[PDB]
């Protein structure tokens, strides 16, 4: 199973300096050997074989070299220790014992499978066991994608290999926003080309003025001129980001950032060969499970002339207090997405103490009318009819089943289903958004079921069979297609869209609106829909993504959506939306689908995608609802990712040492002073096993960042109750001074970081809309990565302090403005105030829209240069609706006098200023820029409903941004609404230009 803790032994986080190890000799002898906790297996084996000579039957023992050790690990796995350089403390032993064996089996497969199992947090052999044919087919069938990717990587070696390892970190378009272009001097950029001259490794500087449009070779060309053959490559100073592809220099994110910030782009020229040599040739190998044996009258669904019928037999048990509840029943529903295909049918009520129904439930659905993605969503509910004629219905356990399997076979016969716990905050009687399949925990309520038998195996019809042919409105259609995904669509508009389904092709972007106008409980309408999507024009990737959410379960619809991504979705956007693309995988009816294959292909052809793909899946391996899907997927990634597996295992080992350390402080050292805890941190971090694991690995926040040696004098436990670890590392890059010397990260074990991760993602997407629309509203979407259950990394922003930190060490309402003055004296003052105002506006708009948690002096930080940003988002949307039942849209970021004084440069009447007038205009422009991209934000939130985030469980939870963005109003009405919210929150000050026409 998955490892209970991150300890060195079971029930022991840390082994003592010296420990007794039970050694099981091959002659039946047992030797107790006192070992050092950090001793290697070579040392232990040598000490055991020397001591074994003092015990009977030593004559039966061969050379120590003939054997290896095997033991039971914390994963209940019998692991063979082929890497004898490993230390006893890093073996993850269940108990301190070692058994001496002769190496057998395929050594290299065993070594690879253990490396895979380590990365993935689960032993590979657990998959080999699984009875389910869908699972074993997925394991074999996905190998096609693995092959494809690896072959495509050795196509143009070593460039195609370098392109995989170090892909171009570029924007989606070379088109430079006019406000970025005006920072250029006649469409030209000043770059600094550094070179590491041999043999002393002296750093040479070369300032170059070149076209922003200059391809990387053209930059090399100019550097040569300032003393033909593209035998050199460009790299960013201070990190592992290369310019290997022919993209205009300005299209590369690093360069694009340098222009906008007025920063000097510092590049490094190196030999194409010095990088190509350091790249190892990656070799995928077909696993054992692909080279082995298995598998030791048919009707169409359309010929079954009968209604739908399902028998609910009995449930093993329920956990209910009989003195508080009256009766229990089975609620069921037939669903296509989150939409019932017919009315929900309940069984009769029976007593808590005897869950037995033996009842056929008849559904108002004709078996041939069942769509391909149809599901049986069910639950066992409790009913208490205590007060009045009022009865409270509460779900106890739920379960969902696909009515057809991966092979298109209609479900038949007796079926047992282990039910799942009701997710926190879910009050609905059914969970149609939850995963399909039985609960792997068999110590749960088990519901016995029975489907109809039709004397044969029923299969869903073939696609050939399904292809059965059996002016004022042009402007109405455009108006419906502009509307947001969650806009109300009337039965009239449905009937209208359905009637005009053929003219609909002229406006392809209406496809989600049209798909929701289809009666999915009618094989007549669906057959026709299927023909339309087959010959449907492609839509934009940001529109196609909606078709991958829980509203669109149909395989043809999802298939169509995946093809839009295959052809139109840039790696920049796949990286930007990967969080959502990984989440929608949970909505997939089956393990093998077009989405999972596309994402794996991409993760295996781009290492920047591969890194986050791995971490998003690895972080949810503790969650039994998706751990089998996510596990099999991660095994196939790890099997084909090449050398990146080695670097991933170094990241995973560093993180386990951090989890264990924080677990010790949180549990054993919980009632100990900061000095006592700090002394313990200091001595532990100094240990070689610790120093080896936490030095010289890639940053899980950004794999282009090398974490060299730890600066132990800068590492500390933070005052916050979760006891976060502040960690500092040296940047080992040759030119680190040109980027950063200190790579500081906060390690947090205790809080769930998924909502912060999402809020930070949205802020980045917002910041990018604004830049592209000509608005320089500088945001700080600091790195944040969830790596497991309530555990993650947070990127430290240097030279930045909280408002409370600034307020102390100096307080009045001018303390903040005074602090900024002291840090930005003379010429650089104005820029500090401009940056504060711009950043301040972006945060004001963004937080109002998202409904982030209330701001205070401790969760608002200001950089030394004036850049204001928010930290600790935690909550979002209508998080206060259940708790207080007030129908309002809060202004989390109310600009106090302290901020107003900064914006107004210390003026008396702060709102009547031109500074505040310009700040208002920034807010208005930002608000309308997001409101225009409303569909994106609605899709991104819709694609996270299955995530398990408390504040994002239904589409009704997304309604909040429909309110703050005032989507059911006109653009002019929405701006009036924003202005009123600001005025009501700030008690006046917010004005504009014109009322009737809203023209200057």
């Amino acid at each position: 199973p998955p490892r209970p803790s991150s300890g060195e032994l079971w029930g022991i986080h840390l082994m003592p300096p010296r420990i007794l190890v039970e050694c099981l000799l091959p002659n039946g002898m047992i030797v107790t050997l006192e070992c050092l906790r950090e001793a290697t297996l070579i040392t232990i084996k040598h000490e055991l074989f020397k001591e074994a000579r003092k015990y009977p039957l030593h004559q039966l023992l061969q050379d120590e070299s003939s054997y290896i050790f095997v033991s039971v690990t914390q994963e209940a796995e019998r692991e063979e220790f082929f890497d004898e350089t490993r230390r006893l403390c890093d073996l993850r032993l269940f108990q301190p014992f070692l058994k001496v064996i002769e190496p057998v089996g395929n050594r290299e497969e065993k070594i690879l499978n253990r490396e895979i199992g380590f990365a993935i947090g689960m032993p590979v052999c657990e998959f080999d066991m699984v009875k389910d044919p869908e699972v074993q087919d997925f394991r074999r069938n996905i190998l096609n994608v693995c092959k494809e990717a690896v072959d495509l990587r050795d196509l143009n070696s070593p460039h195609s290999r370098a392109m995989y390892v170090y892909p171009p970190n570029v924007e989606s378009s070379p088109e430079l926003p006019k406000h970025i272009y005006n920072k250029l001097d006649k469409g030209q950029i000043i770059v600094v080309i550094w070179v590491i001259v041999s043999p002393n490794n002296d750093k040479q500087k070369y300032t170059l003025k070149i076209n922003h449009d200059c391809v990387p070779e053209q930059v090399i060309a100019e550097a040569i001129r300032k003393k033909y053959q593209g035998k050199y490559i460009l790299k960013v100073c201070g990190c592992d980001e290369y310019f290997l592809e022919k993209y205009p220099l300005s299209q590369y994110k690093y360069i694009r950032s340098c222009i906008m910030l007025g920063r000097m782009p510092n590049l490094m020229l190196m030999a194409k060969e010095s990088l190509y040599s350091q790249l190892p040739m990656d070799c995928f190998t077909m696993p054992s499970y692909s080279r082995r044996i298995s598998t030791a009258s048919t009707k169409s669904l359309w010929v079954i002339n009968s209604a739908l019928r399902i028998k609910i037999l009995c449930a093993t048990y329920v956990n209910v207090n009989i003195r508080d509840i009256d009766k229990i029943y089975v609620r069921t529903g037939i669903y296509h997405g989150g939409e019932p295909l017919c009315d929900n049918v309940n069984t009769q009520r029976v007593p808590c103490s005897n869950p037995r129904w033996n009842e056929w439930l008849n559904y108002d659905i004709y078996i041939p009318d069942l769509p391909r993605a149809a599901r049986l969503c069910l639950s066992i509910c409790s009913v208490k009819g205590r007060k009045g004629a009022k009865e409270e219905h509460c779900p106890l356990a739920w379960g969902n089943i696909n009515l057809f399997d991966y092979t298109d076979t209609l479900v038949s016969g007796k079926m047992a289903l282990n039910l799942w716990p009701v997710p926190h905050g879910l009050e609905d009687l059914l969970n149609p958004i939850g995963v399909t399949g039985s609960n792997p925990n068999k110590e749960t309520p088990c519901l016995e079921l029975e489907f109809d038998w039709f004397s044969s195996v029923v299969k869903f019809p073939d696609m050939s069979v399904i292809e059965e042919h059996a002016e004022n409105d042009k402007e109405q259609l455009k108006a419906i297609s502009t509307r947001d995904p969650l806009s109300e669509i009337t039965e009239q508009e449905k009937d209208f869209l359905w009637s005009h389904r053929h003219y609909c092709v002229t406006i392809p972007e209406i496809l989600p609106k049209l798909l929701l106008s289809v009666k999915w409980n009618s094989r007549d309408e669906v057959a026709q829909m299927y023909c339309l999507v087959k010959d449907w024009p492609p839509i934009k990737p940001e529109q196609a993504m909606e078709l991958l959410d829980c509203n669109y379960p149909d395989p043809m619809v999802r298939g169509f959506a995946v093809r839009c991504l295959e052809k139109y979705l840039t790696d920049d956007k796949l990286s930007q939306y990967l969080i959502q693309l990984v989440q929608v995988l949970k909505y997939e009816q089956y393990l093998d689908n077009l989405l999972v294959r596309f994402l794996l292909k991409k993760a295996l052809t781009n290492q920047r995608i591969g890194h986050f793909f791995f971490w998003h899946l690895k972080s949810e391996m503790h969650n039994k609802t998706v751990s089998q899907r996510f596990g099999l997927l991660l095994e196939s990634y790890c099997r084909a990712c090449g050398m990146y597996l080695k670097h991933l295992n170094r990241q995973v080992e560093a993180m386990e040492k951090l989890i264990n350390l924080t677990d010790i402080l949180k549990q054993e050292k919980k009632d100990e002073t900061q000095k006592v805890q700090m002394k313990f941190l200091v001595e532990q971090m100094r240990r070689p096993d610790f120093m080896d694991a936490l030095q010289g690995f890639l940053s899980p926040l950004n794999p282009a960042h090398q974490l060299g040696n730890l600066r132990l004098e800068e590492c500390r436990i933070m005052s916050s109750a979760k006891r976060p670890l502040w960690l500092n590392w040296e940047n080992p890059d040759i030119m680190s001074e040109l980027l950063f010397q200190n790579n500081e990260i906060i390690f947090k074990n205790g809080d769930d970081l998924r909502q912060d991760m999402l809020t930070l993602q949205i802020i980045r997407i917002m910041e990018n809309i604004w830049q592209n629309q000509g608005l320089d509203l500088r945001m700080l979407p600091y790195g944040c990565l969830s790596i497991g259950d309530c555990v993650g990394l947070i990127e430290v922003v240097r030279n930045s302090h909280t408002i409370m930190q600034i307020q102390c060490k100096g307080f009045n309402s001018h303390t903040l403005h005074q602090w900024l003055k002291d840090k930005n004296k003379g010429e650089i003052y104005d820029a500090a105030i401009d940056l504060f105002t711009r950043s301040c506006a972006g945060y004001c708009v963004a937080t109002f829209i998202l409904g982030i948690g209330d701001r205070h002096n401790s969760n608002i930080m200001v950089k030394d240069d004036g850049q204001l940003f928010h930290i600790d988002f935690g909550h979002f949307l209508d998080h206060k609706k259940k708790k207080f039942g007030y129908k309002r849209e809060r202004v989390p970021f109310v600009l106090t006098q302290d901020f107003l004084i900064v914006i107004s440069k210390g003026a008396q009447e702060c709102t009547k200023t031109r500074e505040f007038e310009r700040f208002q205009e920034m807010c208005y422009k930002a608000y309308l820029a997001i409101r225009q991209h409303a569909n994106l934000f609605i899709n991104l939130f819709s694609m996270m409903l299955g995530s398990g985030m408390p504040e994002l469980q239904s589409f009704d939870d997304i309604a909040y941004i429909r309110k703050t963005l005032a989507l059911d109003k006109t653009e002019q009405e929405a701006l009036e609404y924003f202005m009123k919210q600001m005025n009501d929150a700030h008690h006046g000050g917010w004005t504009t230009k014109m009322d009737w026409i809203f023209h200057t």
């Binding site: 199973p1 490892r3 209970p4 079971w10 039970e22 099981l24 091959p26 002659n27 039946g28 002898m29 047992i30 015990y55 009977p56 039957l57 039966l60 039971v72 690990t73 914390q74 994963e75 209940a76 796995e77 019998r78 269940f94 108990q95 014992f97 058994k99 956990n319 209910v320 207090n321 508080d324 509840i325 939409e339 019932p340 009315d343 929900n344 409790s382 208490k384 409270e392 219905h393 509460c394 106890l396 716990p421 926190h424 009050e427 009687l429 925990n441 110590e443 109300e488 009337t490 039965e491 009239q492 409980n521 259940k882 708790k883 207080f884 039942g885 007030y886 009704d956 309604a959 109003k969």
Partner: protein, 240 residues
């Protein structure tokens, strides 16, 4: 016949509020409310159908909105009445006193649910840890039993031979190690037995946390709905 006094008209209520009202209702359950002209929402086949009131499709015979609803009456109405039966109190002071009571009860009960939910999660996690640990003991015990078997297979011939050489020290050395091996297995088996005990107790402790939670969940929903009902009553009674 009459207008705003009508039980099925609800005014400014949102789609979401209607979804809450029409939740798990029977085909024909309906209500009318302001759009964004009004919107009739009709419960049919497990879904809420939104039908726009311009008359649905033109020309009309609309007369007044009430004549349209009564023409199709669209079986059961969601009445404004009986919802307003929940708040008995006459004055603003008696209602505010009762809202403060319910809101205080709700916040306590919420904090109790949160505390109970954390113990549910912890117990559920701990149970999963012990299950993995028993699997590890099961695999460990098997290896130690294999050592006995392996010692038994070898020594059988050596002890038989050692008696021919009169070496009583060597036979005592062999069986001293077999005693060490057996005592260790008894120590491992006993340690698994005790873990099996804690798990049986914690599995029982989980059933009871689940039981307690299935009891507060319905009482927390009801109490919140009352808090919210008194809150709505106090907004409408107070100045607008």
């Amino acid at each position: 016949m009459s207008l705003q006094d009508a039980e099925w008209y609800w005014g400014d209520i949102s789609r979401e509020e209607v979804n809450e009202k029409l939740r798990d209702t029977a085909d024909g359950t309906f209500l009318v409310r302001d759009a964004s002209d009004y919107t009739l929402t009709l419960r049919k086949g497990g879904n809420n159908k939104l039908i726009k009131i311009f008359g649905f499709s033109d020309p009309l015979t609309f007369s007044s909105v009430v004549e349209l609803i009564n023409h199709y009456r669209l079986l059961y109405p969601v009445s404004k009445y009986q919802q307003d039966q929940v708040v008995k109190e006459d004055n603003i002071e008696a209602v505010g006193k009762k809202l403060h009571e319910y809101n205080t009860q709700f916040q306590e009960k919420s904090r109790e649910y949160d505390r109970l939910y954390e113990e549910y999660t912890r117990t559920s996690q701990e149970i999963q840890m012990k299950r993995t640990a028993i699997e590890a003991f099961n695999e460990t015990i098997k290896i130690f039993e294999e050592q006995c078997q392996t010692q038994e297979r070898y020594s059988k011939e050596y002890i038989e031979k050692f008696k021919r050489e009169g070496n009583e020290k060597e036979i005592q050395r062999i069986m001293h190690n077999y005693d060490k091996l057996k005592s260790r297995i008894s120590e491992i088996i006993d340690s698994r037995r005790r873990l099996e005990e804690d798990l049986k107790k914690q599995a029982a402790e989980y059933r009871e946390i689940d039981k307690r939670m299935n009891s507060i969940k319905p009482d927390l929903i009801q109490l919140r709905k009352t808090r919210d009902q008194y809150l709505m009553w106090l907004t409408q009674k107070g100045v607008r």
